[PDB]
Amino acid sequence: MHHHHHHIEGRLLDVTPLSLGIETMGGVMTTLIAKNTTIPTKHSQVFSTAEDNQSAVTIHVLQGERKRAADNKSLGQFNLDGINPAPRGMPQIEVTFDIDADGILHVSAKDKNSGKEQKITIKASSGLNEDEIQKMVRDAEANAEADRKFEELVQTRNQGDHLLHSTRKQVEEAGDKLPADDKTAIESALTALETALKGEDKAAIEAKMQELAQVSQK
Amino acid sequence: MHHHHHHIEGRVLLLDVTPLSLGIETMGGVMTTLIAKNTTIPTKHSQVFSTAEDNQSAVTIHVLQGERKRAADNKSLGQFNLDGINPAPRGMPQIEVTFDIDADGILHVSAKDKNSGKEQKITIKASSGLNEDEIQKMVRDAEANAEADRKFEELVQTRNQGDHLLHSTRKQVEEDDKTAIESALTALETALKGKAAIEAKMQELAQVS
Numbered sequence: 530m531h532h533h534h535h536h537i538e539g540r541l542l543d544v545t546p547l548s549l550g551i552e553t554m555g556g557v558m559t560t561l562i563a564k565n566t567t568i569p570t571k572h573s574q575v576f577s578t579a580e581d582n583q584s585a586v587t588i589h590v591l592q593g594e595r596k597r598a599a600d601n602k603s604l605g606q607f608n609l610d611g612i613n614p615a616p617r618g619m620p621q622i623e624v625t626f627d628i629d630a631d632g633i634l635h636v637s638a639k640d641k642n643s644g645k646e647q648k649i650t651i652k653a654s655s656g657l658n659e660d661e662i663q664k665m666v667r668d669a670e671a672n673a674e675a676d677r678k679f680e681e682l683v684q685t686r687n688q689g690d691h692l693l694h695s696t697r698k699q700v701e702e703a704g705d706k707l708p709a710d711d712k713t714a715i716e717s718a719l720t721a722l723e724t725a726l727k728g729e730d731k732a733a734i735e736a737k738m739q740e741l742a743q744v745s746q747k
Numbered sequence: 748m749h750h751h752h753h754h755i756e757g758r759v760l761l762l763d764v765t766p767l768s769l770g771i772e773t774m775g776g777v778m779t780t781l782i783a784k785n786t787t788i789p790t791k792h793s794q795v796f797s798t799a800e801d802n803q804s805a806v807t808i809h810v811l812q813g814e815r816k817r818a819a820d821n822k823s824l825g826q827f828n829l830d831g832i833n834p835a836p837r838g839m840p841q842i843e844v845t846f847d848i849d850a851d852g853i854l855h856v857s858a859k860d861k862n863s864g865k866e867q868k869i870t871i872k873a874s875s876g877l878n879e880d881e882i883q884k885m886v887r888d889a890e891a892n893a894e895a896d897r898k899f900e901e902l903v904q905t906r907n908q909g910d911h912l913l914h915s916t917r918k919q920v921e922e923d924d925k926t927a928i929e930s931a932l933t934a935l936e937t938a939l940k941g942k943a944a945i946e947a948k949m950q951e952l953a954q955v956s
């Protein structure tokens with residue numbers, strides 16, 4: 530009398546062996562469920578569109594926590610289409626990761642307007658063994674440098690690609706008044722920006738961003 | 748007859764049919780229809796597929812919807828992977844793919860390996876979805892393309908068979924005198940990248956076998 534309490538720990542219904550999440554722009558993994566999360570676990574988070582007016586969206590499920598989603602694993606994949614046109618970014622899609630007591634995974638994507646949604650339910654039945662996942666963890670903690678660095682690069686290449694397409698917009702879609710010689714300028718600007726962002730170097734791509742930035746004046 | 752013949756009809760409550768033929772991508776990026784368009788539901792269809800190479804490890808079940816024969820000419824739906832299957836030559840393992848649909852729109856994709864015992868199953872639903880205008884458009888354009896896609900199917904069928912032949916050849920050689928067979932190979936594959944001249948190529952590699 531009263532309020533006699535103490536602290537808590539994990540429930541034991543087994544923890545996740547490896548982190549789960551989806552793939553975002555730049556081919557990078559964003560973890561929606563951290564490694565060793567005691568289940569049943571439901572995480573809700575809201576992503577959105579990369580490009581203008583795109584009518585669909587893909588959700589690619591991952592495991593094996595590491596950046597560069599192609600270096601992780603693929604649990605499943607699916608689409609959500611029929612969505613209404615909006616400029617790049619900011620429609621509202623809602624991604625939900627659910628795991629019940631049976632460890633069977635449920636991924637869902639919803640739309641604020643629309644309301645056309647999809648979902649997947651993954652029954653496993655095979656999975657993996659401690660050895661393999663330990664190899665994945667080891668390889669992950671060895672590659673942490675190039676991983677985080679790659680994340681940085683993805684952020685950058687995203688900014689530069691977005692700025693570039695926005696420059697193509699603000700050039701062609703913008704008035705055709707066409708100040709003299711603008712052609713060559715923004716042409717090799719945005720083009721060198723292209724063949725820069727195609728390959729991967731941070732310094733080169735941002736430099737090219739500046740090169741296209743100075744000529745974007747008028 | 749003689750008791751009651753009085754034959755049957757498709758069972759439908761109201762709206763329940765598959766509007767689009769549901770299928771799975773196979774080689775050469777060609778759609779293999781597991782459940783045809785305009786099929787009453789519930790409906791379940793099972794088939795057996797297999798690997799394109801020895802010890803292929805995992806495999807990608809790719810679920811699509813549309814009437815087009817080509818991969819990209821359709822609208823994808825979902826996909827997943829079945830891994831951890833034993834070493835074995837092409838076509839040797841039996842991989843069972845199952846498309847289920849119940850009274851709802853919800854579909855169950857099963858994939859199993861009879862020999863390995865390994866199984867993986869996923870569950871998604873029906874359409875993504877997409878508006879009826881779209882679907883009607885894809886259908887109209889499908890009827891449009893038609894025989895072109897048919898020739899595409901015959902094509903990928905050949906190219907797949909011939910590729911199987913080339914793999915079987917190089918594998919049978921273990922590189923004699925096969926020099927003639929090797930440059931005839933290189934030529935035949937050079938043609939194999941880009942119609943009936945491919946069948947001719949198969950004939951040519953068969954002759955110098």
Ligand SMILES: C(#C[P+](c1ccccc1)(c1ccccc1)c1ccccc1)c1ccccc1
Pocket residue numbers: 762763764765766767769812848850851852873874876
């Ligand atoms: C479908 C459907 P749908 C439907 C509703 C209720 C019961 C069975 C099927 C549907 C409707 C709304 C959202 C999602 C699916 C349907 C309804 C009317 C016409 C065509 C299809 C479908 C089924 C198989 C493959 C692709 C699509």
